[PDB]
Amino acid sequence: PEVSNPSKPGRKTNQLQYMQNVVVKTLWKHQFAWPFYQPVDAIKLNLPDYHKIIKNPMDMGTIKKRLENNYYWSASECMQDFNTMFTNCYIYNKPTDDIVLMAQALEKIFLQKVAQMPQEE
């Protein structure tokens, strides 16, 4: 989707800096992260049912650019986008698919880092 929205409030916070410089950075370096770097390409991957099932696509490249563009008002909003990305993967793919295991390992790290996020100040 959009990396900026003229009608949506956005700002800088120390927590959003943490999302950018700790959470995004830590997940990007993981070997399981590459399926999430860019929007799902239903044509290249021949997934003619992907956009029939997933209505609100999300990916880590979009989250990263949103952080750089001050799209978010709060860290919780950026966390919600991470959640949309992982939840889409669980909703669409087969329960036994490799990508589901990849999503699970990344989401565990996501939640661990969120648990350590500095208090908003």
Binding site: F32, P35, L45, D49, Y92, N93, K94, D97, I99
Partner: peptide
């Protein structure tokens, strides 16, 4: 559902 195939995990 079609799904994305193996990713060598």
């Amino acid at each position: 559902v079609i799904g994305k195939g193996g990713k060598n995990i």
